[PDB]
Structure 1
Amino acid sequence: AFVVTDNCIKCKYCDCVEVCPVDCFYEGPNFLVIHPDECIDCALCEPECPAQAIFSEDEVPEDMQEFIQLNAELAEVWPNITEKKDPLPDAEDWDGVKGKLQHLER
């Protein structure tokens, strides 16, 4: 499974959803998650993310291990997003800011 991590929060560019062959992205107000069960590990999404927030499960940084389980949980409660939409307004101001998990909205 591929995992979306911290830098997506408050950025949510949505370029990743365009490339997914199986539509396994689920949408929150200010973040996206990959459903671990439906992802076929094609790796097509991670060159696409401008925030470089997507990682293969086995490459997730040590300080971001929480995200693996977070993506699995939130994928069960959020709606499926199959079409790209515009980035959040101030997306590039928040891109690269660290510790944005304190700003995650359910």
Structure 2
Amino acid sequence: AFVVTDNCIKCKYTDCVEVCPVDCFYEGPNFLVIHPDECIDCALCEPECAAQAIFSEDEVPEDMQEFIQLNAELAEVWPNITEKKDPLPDAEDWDGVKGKLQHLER
């Protein structure tokens, strides 16, 4: 599985979904997650994300390990998303700010 990590929050560009062959992105108000059992590890979404928030599970930074199970949990409850949409307003402002987990919306 690939995993969406902190810099997605409050950015949510959603360019990542358009290349996902198996449609395994799930949408929250201000964050996206990858369903780890649906994900086929094709890696195509990783270069598409301007926030550089996507990692293969084995390369998730030590200080973002929580996002691995968070992705698996939220993918069970959020609705699938399979089409590009406009980035969040002020996405640019939040791209690169750390610890945005504190702002995650359910």
Q: Same fold (TM over 0.5)?
A: yes
Deviation at 1:7, TM superposition (A): 0.1
Deviation at 1:64, TM superposition (A): 0.3
Cα distance in 1 for residues equivalent to 2:82 and 2:12: 14
Deviation at 1:79, TM superposition (A): 0.1
Q: How many residues align?
A: 106
Deviation at 1:60, TM superposition (A): 0.2
Deviation at 1:21, TM superposition (A): 0.3
Deviation at 1:45, TM superposition (A): 0.3
Cα distance in 1 for residues equivalent to 2:95 and 2:68: 20
Equivalent residue of 1:17, what SS?
helix
Deviation at 1:52, TM superposition (A): 0.1
Q: Scaled by the length of structure 1, what TM-score is found?
A: 1.00
Deviation at 1:71, TM superposition (A): 0.1
Cα distance in 2 for residues equivalent to 1:82 and 1:59: 25
RMSD: 0.3
- Structure 1: 4+ residue segments shifted above 3 A: none
Give structure 1 stretches of 5+ with no counterpart.
Answer: none
The aligned residue for residue 34 of structure 2 is: 34
**C-alpha deviations, 1:80-105, integer Å up to 9, x for none?**
00111000010000000000000000
Q: Scaled by the length of structure 2, what TM-score is found?
A: 1.00
Query: How many percent of aligned residue pairs carry the same amino acid?
Result: 98
